[PDB]
Amino acid sequence: QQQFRNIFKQIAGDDMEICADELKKVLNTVVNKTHGFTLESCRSMIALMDTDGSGKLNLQEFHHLWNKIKAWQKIFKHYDTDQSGTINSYEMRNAVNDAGFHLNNQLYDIITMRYADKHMNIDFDSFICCFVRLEGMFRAFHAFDKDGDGIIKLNVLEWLQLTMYALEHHH
């Protein structure tokens, strides 16, 4: 992680961790070309990759976030054949499935309604935002499902753990 370490150091600043603002800046500087990451996205990335609960991303946490964005970008580029900077809503079903998320029709429509624009396309920022929320929601759940069957039984404090973790707070 030669100058990856160095990129992290520049933006992280004095506390050596990355808050939402620093993440936007680094992400829009290095993943580049309207087509940029919003502060909404970067906050949900922090919220969901912040594994030690510090509230900001350290190097290790940032590096995992980064490998995730790249892999998701590969899938975007694969479906945006006509370089439009967007994929239509049908391709999103495919994208999500390719990235490992086998869902259902109710969920595919929720995703389209939430993340598609008025032409029914989905830009990269929305694309990444949606995948961040799916991975984050899946990992929150998975922590109670180490056996892997996709089914969990919860008591009330377990459900409060899950849900209070899942509900982001922005102010």
**51: closest CA among 69, 71, 72, 65?**
65
Query: Would you count residue 13 as binding Ca ion (CB under 5 A)?
Result: yes
Q: With CB under 5 A as the contact rule, which of the stretches 50-58, 62-70, 110-118, 155-163 interacts with Ca ion?
A: 50-58
Query: Would you count residue 157 as binding a second copy (CB under 8 A)?
Result: yes
Q: Strand 121-123 relative to strand 86-88: parallel, antiparallel, unpaired?
A: antiparallel
* The Cα angle at residue 115 between residues 114 and 121, in degrees rounded to 5: 130
Q: With CB under 5 A as the contact rule, which of the stretches 35-43, 72-80, 99-107, 124-132 interacts with Ca ion?
A: 72-80
For residue 28, give every residue at least 6 positions away whose Cβ sits within 8 Å of its Cβ, in sequence order, or none: 36, 37
Within 126-155, the residues that bind a second copy by CB under 8 A are 126, 129-130, 133-134, 137-138, 140-142, 145, 150-155
Residue 22 labeled ligand binder: yes
Which CB sits closer to a second copy, 30 or 109? 109
